[PDB]
């Protein structure tokens, strides 16, 4: 997908430090792969949560503003593209994705938004976004 590749390209451009400087900080966030046509509202939640995570005051302090704005534009386009194409099962899938973002939120707060903690999270989202969009 061109949109997916562009989203990843912008998240790669946002990188400030190398994860090679943070290899002892490897952390498993338990991305619920078990939840991923029926996966469209689940992928929608995933993109909305990436937008939420990178739109906080903490994210604005950590990453370049011009690159973040380009990133939001691409996430907006992805959300729009998904809207163009059992309710309780869908709710359950959405709740599992939300718990994964809750672990990321707690981790950044616990690590006091350090450069390594933000690079661990950025690399985590490069991986889970690639998986969720089956790129």
């Amino acid at each position, epitope marked *: 997908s061109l949109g997916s590749r562009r989203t990843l390209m912008l998240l790669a451009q946002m990188r400030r430090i190398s994860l090679f400087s943070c*290899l002892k900080d490897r952390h498993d966030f338990g991305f619920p792969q078990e939840e991923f046509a029926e996966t469209i509202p689940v992928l929608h939640e995933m993109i909305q949560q990436i937008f939420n995570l990178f739109s906080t005051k903490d994210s604005s302090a950590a990453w370049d503003e011009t690159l973040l704005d380009k990133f939001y534009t691409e996430l907006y386009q992805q959300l729009n593209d998904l809207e163009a194409c059992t309710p309780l099962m869908k709710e359950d899938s959405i709740l599992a994705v939300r718990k994964y973002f809750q672990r990321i939120t707690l981790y950044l707060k616990e690590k006091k938004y350090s450069p390594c903690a933000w*690079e661990v999270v950025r690399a985590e989202i*490069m991986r889970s976004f690639s998986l969720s969009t089956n790129l």
Partner: single-chain antibody
Amino acid sequence: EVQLVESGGDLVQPGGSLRLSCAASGFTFSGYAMAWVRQAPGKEMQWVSSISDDGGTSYYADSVEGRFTVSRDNSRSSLYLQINNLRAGDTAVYHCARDHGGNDYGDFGHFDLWGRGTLVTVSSSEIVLTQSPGTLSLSPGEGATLSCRASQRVSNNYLAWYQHRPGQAPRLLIYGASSRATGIPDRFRGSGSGTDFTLTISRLEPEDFAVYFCQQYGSAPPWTFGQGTKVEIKG
């Protein structure tokens, strides 16, 4: 020609020391993280040390920390390993290796270029990867199915497969459990996730009869290797 050539290995007495060197050519050395990986006779490959492209960050295996020092000289395209207070456990072929990991994903700890190695002969929880079978005896044109089982879930599917032909430096075949490295033919297929990984070779050519070994690079260091499966011709 893209190459890594090690030197410095020698017969050495216990307690003694050596300075190993690796001359890199055919590529911009200063853009890559590098590593030393050793193999003792009859043993699995063992990651020893890694160093960042600029030499500002290094990692070591616990058994060599404080005795070994990795360094590099980007102006001379060279990597070094000063190995001190040597013991029986340090006897091994020492390979220089280029990290295939990129900054985009942070997938460091696996290697797309290796040297043949330099020989060090001293006179006289980690993830465990189990490969099966130990030896596969097959006919020309037949296929092979190789197994690599990890004792813990391999994070991010960071599981690599390497081919080792006699007299040659190891070669990366697969990275990220299923991605074929540049130039690797379609007949090599990597698959699996979690703890169970598979390498399939659909039709063996003469050059495919070799030792195949797996490696996980999902953990924080140390990154670990399987003991290898030798694929041989059923004479």
